[PDB]
Design a protein around this ligand. Sequence first.
Ligand SMILES: CN1N=C(N)c2cn([C@@H]3O[C@H](COP(=O)(O)O)[C@@H](O)[C@H]3O)c3ncnc1c23
Ligand SMILES: CN1N=C(N)c2cn([C@@H]3O[C@H](COP(=O)(O)O)[C@@H](O)[C@H]3O)c3ncnc1c23
Lengths: 125, 127
Amino acid sequence: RRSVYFCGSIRGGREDQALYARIVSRLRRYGKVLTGDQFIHEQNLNWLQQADVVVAEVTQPSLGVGYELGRAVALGKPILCLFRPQSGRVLSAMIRGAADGSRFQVWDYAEGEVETMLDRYFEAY
Amino acid sequence: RRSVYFCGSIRGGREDQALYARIVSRLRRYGKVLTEGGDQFIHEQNLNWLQQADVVVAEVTQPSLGVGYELGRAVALGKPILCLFRPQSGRVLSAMIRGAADGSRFQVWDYAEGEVETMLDRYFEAY
Ligand SMILES: CN1N=C(N)c2cn([C@@H]3O[C@H](COP(=O)(O)O)[C@@H](O)[C@H]3O)c3ncnc1c23
Ligand SMILES: CN1N=C(N)c2cn([C@@H]3O[C@H](COP(=O)(O)O)[C@@H](O)[C@H]3O)c3ncnc1c23
């Protein structure tokens, strides 16, 4: 059974929290979902090393999500970023520009599509 | 000359623009500041500068994917890091940045809005 690490804004804001729950619920079909500040950081870094794939929802700007992505790229992890363009935001150049189409992927989606997007990525992975 | 890479929110919000310019100015005293095609060019140019950099300085008060990402890449390259956070903002700093501190290779310092130059001074003559 493969490991999935999911990334989503917390102190950047909990606006998309309910959408994170849907993503996590869907990911459970595709693997085990892995996901006092030092302990938080070390436990997360531990789980990040274990993960076979990293999935982030990057619509809500977040330091932690970005940092997780950064450590994940350096660890050679396959990454999927999901961004909602209809949110009115322009995605961070550093995230969007990291997309190489294989190891680092960034997918634009509509709020109601999230499940079908996840299925599409994993049915190809 | 010594190279400094500076990180600050752009697409996460420009609330702290002025404070970055203040930081950049002071950093110029301690070395060359590398940070003054599309997004792919921006990422590639920035990774190149990050690799060259001797030290990484980030203002982490405004939440930002890019800043976090840069800090993540920087840790993995083994760069010395300094994060500055402003508790006056009312925000609670991300656990992942605050928890990433080891007090030498990765420092996270709290500051008040008039202390920014004096905080930067402290780090560089202890560097
Ligand atoms: C209590 N707490 N606080 C966080 N800020 C915090 C951040 N994170 C991780 O970092 C990301 C959120 O970063 P922030 O939005 O900066 O909070 C999430 O993807 C989490 O995996 C956490 N994981 C467990 N507990 C956490 C946190
Ligand atoms: C045009 N543009 N847009 C960005 N979002 C953007 C982000 N960044 C880098 O990423 C950090 C800001 O990321 P975001 O706040 O997510 O935009 C800064 O510290 C910059 O070094 C950039 N560097 C040059 N040009 C940029 C950007």
